Symmetry: C6
Subunit: 193 residues, 6 copies
């Protein structure tokens, strides 16, 4: 996808942010957005095309792929990026609003509360997506999925495309997410002390 | 698609708009346009390719897919974006026209009536697309579609691609649309008081 | 496709044009070019791939698709955009030529005749494409096409991809075209009075 | 394809050219490059994929498609664009060279001979591609191609994809090419008188 | 993929780097990123599509492709690029931080230790990816892969797409990687003496 | 592929180069890069997809395509472009280095030796790729390839996609390469005298 606009806004955000925040935005751009576009989207491109079920039943592969993958991992990661970035956009907008207010007439007062809330929201959204992915997929895609959804007769064996590569990238993104959490914790403590 | 031109115009619009309007345009860019390009368009890419009907009848899958999905959701969302953005373009053009008039020789007088009408039109178009989608698709795509359109013999069972992911994104976009409504209401009240 | 160059030229044209002309160019960019790229091109992407004929005859689907759709609607719309935009380019070039002439040494004299001719040509090309599409396709694509072109034996039944969505967009573009006509009429009268 | 670089150079060329030359470059950009990218490339995309021959012989469709279309029309048009544009690049380079010479220390002297040669070369390359296409394809693609190339047994019937649309665009490009010839003739005469 | 953002950051890095470092970044951009986008991604595009196993067993090709290629080479190279570039980003950020510090109030002191650590990390990540690829794939892809992973019955013969071209590019990238190592060694020694 | 970065560097190179060198870079951009992107990449897109072998043997088409085309022509041309451009990058970097040296404190002295070496390297790499392609493919792709590589039983007949178009472009690129050689020879002599 085209992340250009979000890029513009977040680049603006870098200036009005802590050094650790600039590190966080670098991580977001490089290890999350760029990995997803350059590497992961191609991994998941044949997810349903090369999903195969051992059966002659029409409609079984469709319902089985749908039950195994209610949302694709890459779409989940898109949404995670958007939601962890939204607080930064809120804070940046409040900052620009105060600048416009000054013109009509760095981090302190209302902006400090807003920045702390921004880090907080980023952390909660962060953790939330991590836990949701754990409960939806664990952290390993196995090659076999056994499916008993109508119209499949009895239980059918279905086979995943590229499960090991997908597992590698699942874990890569989990690690990047954990690094982001650590960075946000560092921001909180660094402001505190 | 390439939303660059609309982006230029709407970016211009941000300056000559209320803070809540800038929030609204941020939502439009991020949670509607970017989600559609980065996430949803891939979800709906195999909508007819992986639509399967249990029959040997030539032409049954075509007519059944057409009856189940007279317009694709993603195309509906494109049109919604365009029509909710058009009023903002009208107001921005009127503003630029007044600026040119001044050169030949912020929100008050004629521009205030135009801005209120802009919010109104945005709200009516907003609600209209919501209700139309409800009446066309509800808010859940089921995996089975039963089709009795000629040439299909008797009633045939047809199966949808990715119904659960599509439902997730249908609801995501409904929520984003409702948030937009709330923002427009806030604009009206904020101008009133 | 990449409409960037035409965009540059037409953007230049906006400055040296009436307010109604700027509205017309906004309509062209948004409701014609952007709709075609973002929405319609995907609708028509599987036009021959998912065109199906009930027969075992080799070559029947090819000749039948060709007879049903001698030109694709989207290609027709491309050509319409180009030809309705060419007069504006002519006028803009004449304007720039007069500017260069001044440097060597707004709408009046020769430029006024050229601007009226520009509106006229735009209107005639407009109407011409509308009428031609009426006579080639009407304004509704039906799901069944009956084809008797060699080598098809006797008359064969062939089935269209996405006829209802295509009809929706056919009518959308017809409406946009009619709105353009109205705008050009307004330009003529507004200059007259 | 990405014509950006050629675009930059030719845009430079516009300034150092006659008004008719600026018209010619507008035609090149709009009615040749943009049509090819936006419209024609999609028409010819399925040229071999949907080329069908009535036979069971392995390799017959490949050799028959190759004999019917030794070069694709769209590739021919690419090459035509490049070769008709090269003289303009030569002249522009000579102009820039004279400018650099002046700095070290409009159309007259050596530049006039170079400009006339540029128009001449453009005209000869123009006519040459026209005539070559006539002798290779005529100006109408018929739906049936009869092929007797080994390994096809005896003569086989093969069927073209989208012959009528292809014919429409063949003739469109022929007309654009003829218009270019007329413009070059006008340049020659306009300089003469 | 779109490497634009990483490009911006690394371009910034060039200024605040040694001549050998500018050579290294030129190599990264040209012989690694550009080769991957322009050449290698097309080579590996049909890696699973044209992976063929001699069997009638459903699911055997999927599990066999997955066992032969747990990660694709091109994805490995993406990750290598990112990780060898991250140290340069760290150093550049520290440099910009010192510049901001100066404003609030070339290579020496803390920046020298950071630059040496940057070269070190680049070298260790470099070597690590080389060795890992050796242990995962060696440096030659053979055309035959023999697979005994469930559900494949007994041992099945599977056949690789484009093994010789893939081997050529594997070795090309190994050579480019070794050249990068040499450049980093030269940086270390050049700073030392 | 995206040649933007190489384009930036080479554009820089134009300024610090001879007139014949600017011609050479124009040829590189237009007749090599642009032809490859706009025309040739589409010609070679179906090279394995539409490669057909007369056999029932699993794996025979894969090994036969691999033996006939160990590297694709278009990938060869990519690599040729990169390697003939690298010397120009070296010289440009040395030039920029001398400029930075001057700031700390056109073609003559060390730069003259470097420029001559640049032309030399360009010429040797040029000739080398030409000769290698001759020895790998000759200069004509025939439609029939006879393949006896295991697992193909005895000798099988395989058929090439688009051999005549491919031959046309092979010869086009050979001619462009020879023109480049001539230009480099002219540079050497022009500096000599
Ligand atoms: C279905 C339980 O059935 P199952 O266990 O048999 O499916 C097994 C898992 N299989 C469906 C993927 C195969 O129900 C579920 O698992 C629902 C899991 C919900 C996962 C996360 C929802 C919240 C995400 C919040 C993100 C935003 C935070 C800011
Ligand atoms: C900044 C954050 C950094 C995070 C980095 C996280 C990287 C995680 C890499 C590997 C995850 C485990 C893969 C796995 O769990 O594989 C299981 C599979 C055996 O599973 P089974 O089917 O036999 O039961 O392993 C096998 O034996 C088959 C061979 C698999 C080898 C895969 C090597 C991947 C190397 C990637 C290096 C990335 C460097 C950045
Ligand atoms: C067809 C009623 O047949 P059915 O209920 O059996 O089809 C069931 C629904 N299925 C056709 C999708 C399967 O007729 C309809 O539903 C027509 C529904 C019309 C939906 C919205 C039209 C207005 C949208 C306005 C947007 C612009 C506002 C500014
Ligand atoms: C700013 C606006 C924010 C709006 C956010 C709206 C997000 C809506 C997310 C989920 C919608 C309900 C999905 C559903 O209705 O699923 C039904 C299906 C059981 O239906 P059935 O076939 O058994 O009958 O559920 C199952 O059990 C299968 C497992 C489905 C788990 C799907 C988890 C999706 C998590 C997305 C998180 C997004 C975070 C932003
Ligand atoms: C064929 C009449 O046979 P049919 O009625 O059986 O074909 C039925 C229509 N079906 C061929 C699409 C199936 O002949 C025709 O219809 C020719 C119709 C010509 C349509 C428009 C040509 C002029 C467009 C001008 C645009 C430029 C203006 C500035
Ligand atoms: C600025 C210019 C604005 C121009 C807007 C023009 C929009 C035209 C929208 C609908 C055109 C009629 C569609 C139709 O003619 O459908 C026929 C079909 C019954 O035909 P049959 O096969 O039963 O015989 O209708 C059915 O019952 C099946 C359900 C079809 C519902 C389609 C709803 C489309 C809503 C689009 C809203 C666009 C908002 C901008
Ligand atoms: C083959 C004559 O056999 P045929 O008539 O049976 O093929 C019938 C035509 N079919 C091969 C396309 C089916 O030989 C030919 O036609 C050769 C025709 C040559 C056409 C143009 C070559 C010069 C283009 C110059 C462009 C550059 C100028 C600046
Ligand atoms: C600035 C330069 C402008 C150049 C414009 C050139 C445009 C050329 C348009 C049409 C060329 C003739 C098409 C043809 O030769 O068609 C033959 C076919 C009967 O051939 P047959 O198989 O029966 O034997 O005609 C039929 O009856 C089937 C219906 C075909 C109708 C096609 C209408 C195309 C309208 C395009 C309008 C473009 C406007 C710019
Ligand atoms: C699987 C050993 O089974 P196998 O030999 O039969 O598989 C044969 C190789 N085949 C799986 C590719 C077919 O286990 C392995 O080979 C694991 C190999 C691990 C390779 C590299 C992991 C570390 C990469 C670090 C990169 C980051 C450094 C900064
Ligand atoms: C700056 C760093 C520069 C690094 C450059 C590294 C380039 C490596 C090129 C070739 C690697 C060996 C290919 C090979 O190992 O091929 C094995 C195959 C016989 O293997 P077999 O199946 O008979 O057992 O060779 C055959 O006989 C079949 C014919 C293969 C000819 C391939 C020629 C490739 C030419 C590429 C030139 C690149 C120039 C930059
Ligand atoms: C700094 C540059 C270092 C360049 C080092 C190049 C080393 C080339 C070694 C080629 C060994 C071929 C062995 C051979 O022949 O065993 C194959 C059989 O015999 C045959 O098929 C005859 C094959 C004949 C190949 C002739 C290759 C000439 C390469 C000249 C490169 C000049 C660069 C300036
Ligand atoms: C294989 C000889 O077997 P064959 O003749 O039966 O293959 C016939 C040719 N077929 C493999 C393409 C079918 O071995 C070869 O031809 C090796 C040919 C090597 C070609 C060029 C290698 C050096 C390129 C240098 C580029 C970089 C310079 C700066
Ligand atoms: C600045 C550098 C300029 C370099 C320009 C190089 C252009 C080379 C063009 C043609 C190369 C020969 C094609 C050929 O060798 O074709 C063989 C084939 C008979 O071979 P066969 O299978 O019968 O045995 O010829 C036939 O008869 C079938 C008809 C083939 C006609 C192809 C015409 C191509 C026209 C391209 C014009 C490009 C203009 C720039």
């Amino acid at each position: 996808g085209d992340w250009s606009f979000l890029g513009r806004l977040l680049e603006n955000a870098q200036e009005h942010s802590t050094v650790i925040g600039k590190v966080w935005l670098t991580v977001l751009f490089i290890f999350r957005i760029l990995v997803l576009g350059a590497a992961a989207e191609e991994v998941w491109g044949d997810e349903q095309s090369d999903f195969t079920c051992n059966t002659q039943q029409p409609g079984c592969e469709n319902v089985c792929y749908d039950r195994a993958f209610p949302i694709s991992h890459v779409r989940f990661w898109v949404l995670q990026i958007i939601f962890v970035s939204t607080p930064t956009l809120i804070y940046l907008g409040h900052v620009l609003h105060l600048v416009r207010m000054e013109e009509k007439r760095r981090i302190a007062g209302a902006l400090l509360r807003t920045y702390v809330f921004n880090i907080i929201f980023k952390t909660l959204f962060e953790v939330g997506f991590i836990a949701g992915q754990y409960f939806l997929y664990g952290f390993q895609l196995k090659p076999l999925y056994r499916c008993d959804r109508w119209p499949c007769p009895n239980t059918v064996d279905c086979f995943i495309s590229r499960p090991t590569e997908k597992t590698i990238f699942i874990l890569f993104m989990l690690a990047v997410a954990c690094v982001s959490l650590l960075l946000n914790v560092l921001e909180i403590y660094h402001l505190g002390w």
